[PDB]
């Protein structure tokens, strides 16, 4: 629909015999977005995940599984 934008907790830059599309953390260890309601303990931080090669960028809370 119109204005159907989705907001991720961690901003990142999707870039490219054969090339490879990767995703990389915009910043290293920048605080996560919309992370105001998580406990004082969780300390949400953005992390860089791979596949070695970058794959995406996720927000990482400190707690139990």
């Amino acid at each position: 629909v119109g204005g159907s934008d989705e907001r991720f907790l961690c901003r990142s830059i999707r870039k490219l015999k054969q090339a490879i599309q990767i995703e990389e953390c915009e910043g290293a260890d920048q605080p996560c977005d919309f992370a105001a309601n998580f406990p004082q303990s969780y300390n949400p931080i953005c992390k860089q995940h791979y596949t070695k090669i970058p794959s995406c960028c996720k927000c990482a809370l400190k707690t139990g599984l």
Binding site: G2, G3, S4, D5, I13, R14, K15, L16, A19, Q21, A36, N37, F38, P39, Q40
Partner: protein
């Protein structure tokens, strides 16, 4: 408008269609490109810049023609000087965007109304920057269509005359700005405003006046706002509000009647209060005709019974992660339609038996991580609808019998990490008493999780009454021994039982005439008692029932004895499985392997002249191996010597026997290793006796003359029986006996 065809075309910037979109890169060969457009036709277009001075916009792709698009997103871009941004959008051939998103930290200037010329038709605008930047209040001029606004520039205060032409604005997002006060006289200019997100600001002393005219507003978020306390009428003008959010604040207390004027509430959330809030004031959520979802987490210590009084619509409640010691009994009296209570992580030690009295529709209950100590009989006697239940990591010790009789709606039951034993005396166990766990009535149950408890028996009900059971977890209990009846699960439903890390020291499996059972990590002793189990582990034994269960045993290891210790179950061979016989003669270690019913007696001390008194052979046993190797015997006892009389094997090598009578030999004999003795001659009666009998004869001082002639004919034909024929020697010079004729010795 713009497709794969335009993409292939040179040499300006290079395009390459990926996934379903197109990743244009200008310049075509740059490492860190000036621009990186990403076009997904008809949908959106993201423009990712990397600019030094504003003059870099030349390297933009020429004559692109992207056509209609709903969403435009600019990241890391220079504000375009005294040029409308809509110019750049025209240059790229974009037509009628619904959303513009401007998100940079390299602006070059401050945002101006002129940037937004020709983008008056917008429905959604977002401007985000972590630069220190001022936002003009004449910025959103003639923005009659803006329905969603969001600005984030560390905004310290916003003057009312910003929202002058925002007549159609329905939702506002100003989180993570520095707003210290609510702008006065604003809701009059926006009569369709529904969402008001003001989280992560500084909106401390809000007051009843701050919301005058906001009867259009449905949702107001003020979480993460240091709010120490609110006036009891802050929301008094918010008459049709439905979603409040007072989270991440600093409440020590709240005034009563706080929501009194807002009887249209649908969900309040007071999660994660950055300081300890002891309790909620009386009737705080009482008399709320539409209130449903609730979320409370402020390290609450107690609650009033009238907290939800007359609020018969609540469906979810999250009272998890508090400090509740108990609950008042009436607390959920009227909450008929409740669906999911969640009291996880408290100091709950008891829940008044009438707590879930009326909560007739309750489905998911969670109580894990508390100090509960046992399930009573009335506590769940109404939850026929309760589908899945959790009490993991408590200190439950006493599940009543009548506890789970009405919970026929239950499917998943997790009582892991407690001190539940079901109080079973071990003697009713050994005597196969048909008795049920309190879970007996739950036939349709799917999940049982008694991990980390103290169960000492696989109860009757879990095999025969629970046929639907798919998941059974008895790992980390205190079951010491299994029988083939402990593996008889009547479940035609992919049952996977976990019996890891218990105290199973033996597995009594017999030779006889779909469920998975993990048995890894167990104190199994590897004596003759677990014989048939090991055969079953390998392809060897498969006694009917075997195929109806599938044992996982890959990490089952023998604890004792020290010989087999450290070694898996598929590796060992059943002849090692011996059970020491204590009776046994002095100086002689003994044992019994049930692999062949063989009573073995090892008297390898090296100091016996007589055959020591031998324990009788059971009327079940079949082999008796008198091992008297490397001693100094003299004569053998009679065939009628008890114990000795039942011997099948006689390993007397390395001894001093000088003559063997046919009566000194056992009736049941089958082997006779008299190698390395003092024998010079064997009578012809002995040779008839040795008619199957494996025999050893070498290493003896054989006097080969005419009286040895029978023996010389024995060997010559009884080749199989004598393993050391070629080693048999004569003492009349010495030559091998197999080098002799019956005439070298006989004139």
């Amino acid at each position: 408008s713009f497709g794969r065809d335009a993409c292939s075309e040179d040499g300006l910037c290079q395009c390459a269609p990926i996934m379903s979109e197109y990743e244009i890169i200008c310049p075509a060969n740059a490492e860190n490109p000036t621009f990186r457009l990403t076009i997904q036709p008809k949908d959106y277009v993201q423009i990712m810049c990397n600019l030094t001075d504003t003059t870099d916009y030349q390297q933009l792709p020429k004559k692109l023609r992207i056509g209609e698009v709903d969403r435009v997103q600019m990241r890391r871009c220079m504000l375009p000087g005294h040029t409308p941004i809509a110019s750049i959008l025209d240059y790229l051939g974009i037509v009628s965007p619904t959303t513009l998103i401007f998100e940079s930290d390299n602006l070059g200037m401050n945002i101006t109304r002129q940037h937004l010329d020709r983008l008056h038709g917008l429905k959604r605008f977002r401007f985000t920057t972590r630069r220190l930047t001022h936002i003009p209040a004449n910025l959103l001029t003639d923005m009659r269509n803006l329905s969603h606004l969001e600005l984030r520039a560390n905004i310290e205060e916003m003057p009312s005359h910003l929202f002058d032409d925002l007549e159609n604005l329905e939702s506002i997002e100003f989180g993570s700005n520095k707003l210290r006060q609510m702008p006065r006289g604003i809701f009059g200019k926006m009569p369709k405003l529904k969402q008001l997100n003001l989280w992560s600001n500084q909106l401390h002393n809000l007051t009843k006046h701050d919301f005058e005219g906001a009867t259009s507003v449905l949702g107001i978020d003020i979480h993460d706002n240091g709010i120490e306390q609110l006036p009891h009428d802050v929301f008094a003008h918010l008459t049709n509000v439905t979603d409040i959010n007072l989270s991440a604040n600093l409440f020590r207390s709240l005034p009563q009647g706080l929501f009194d004027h807002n009887k249209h509430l649908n969900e309040v959330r007071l999660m994660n209060n950055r300081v300890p809030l002891a309790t909620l004031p009386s009737r705080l959520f009482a008399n709320q005709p539409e209130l449903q979802i609730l979320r409370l987490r402020a390290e609450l210590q107690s609650l009033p019974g009238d907290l939800f009084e007359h609020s018969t619509q609540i469906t979810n409640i999250s009272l998890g992660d508090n400090l509740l010691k108990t609950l008042p009994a009436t607390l959920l009296e009227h909450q008929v339609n409740l669906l999911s209570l969640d009291l996880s992580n408290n100091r709950l030690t008891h829940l008044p038996d009438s707590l879930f009295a009326h909560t007739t529709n309750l489905t998911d209950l969670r109580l894990e991580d508390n100090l509960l100590t046992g399930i009573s009989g009335d506590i769940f006697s109404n939850l026929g609808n309760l589908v899945t239940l959790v009490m993991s990591r408590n200190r439950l010790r006493t599940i009543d019998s009548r506890a789970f009789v009405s919970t026929n709606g239950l499917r998943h039951l997790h009582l892991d990490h407690n001190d539940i034993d079901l109080q079973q005396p071990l003697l009713d166990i050994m005597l196969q008493t048909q008795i049920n766990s309190p879970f007996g009535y739950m036939h349709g149950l799917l999940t049982l999780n008694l991990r980390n408890n103290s169960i000492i028996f696989v109860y009757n009900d879990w095999k025969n009454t629970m046929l639907q059971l798919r998941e059974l977890d008895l790992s980390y209990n205190n079951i010491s021994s299994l029988g083939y009846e402990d593996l008889a699960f009547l479940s035609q439903n992919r049952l996977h039982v976990n019996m890891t890390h218990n105290k199973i020291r033996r597995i009594a499996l017999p030779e006889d005439v779909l469920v998975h059972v993990d048995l890894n990590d167990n104190p199994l002793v590897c004596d003759c008692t677990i014989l048939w189990f090991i055969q079953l582990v390998r392809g060897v034994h498969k006694p009917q029932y075997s195929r109806q269960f599938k044992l996982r045993t890959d990490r089952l290891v023998c604890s004792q004895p020290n010989v087999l210790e450290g070694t898996p179950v598929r590796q060992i061979e059943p002849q090692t499985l011996i059970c020491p016989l204590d009776k046994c003669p002095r100086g002689c270690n003994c044992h019994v392997r049930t692999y062949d019913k063989a009573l073995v007696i090892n008297c390898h001390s090296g100091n016996l002249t007589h055959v020591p008194r031998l324990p009788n052979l059971h009327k079940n046993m079949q082999l008796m191996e008198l091992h008297l190797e490397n001693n100094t015997l003299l004569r053998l006892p009679s065939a009628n010597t008890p114990g000795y009389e039942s011997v099948t094997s006689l390993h007397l090598a390395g001894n001093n026997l000088t003559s063997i009578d046919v009566d000194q030999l056992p009736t049941n004999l089958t082997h006779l290793d008299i190698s390395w003795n003092h024998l010079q001659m064997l009578n012809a009666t002995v040779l008839g006796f040795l008619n199957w009998r494996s025999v050893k004869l070498s290493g003896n001082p054989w006097m080969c003359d005419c009286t040895a002639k029978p023996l010389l004919l024995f060997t010559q034909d009884n080749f199989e029986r004598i393993g050391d024929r070629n080693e048999m020697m004569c003492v009349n010079a010495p030559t091998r006996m197999v080098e002799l004729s019956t005439n070298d010795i006989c004139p």
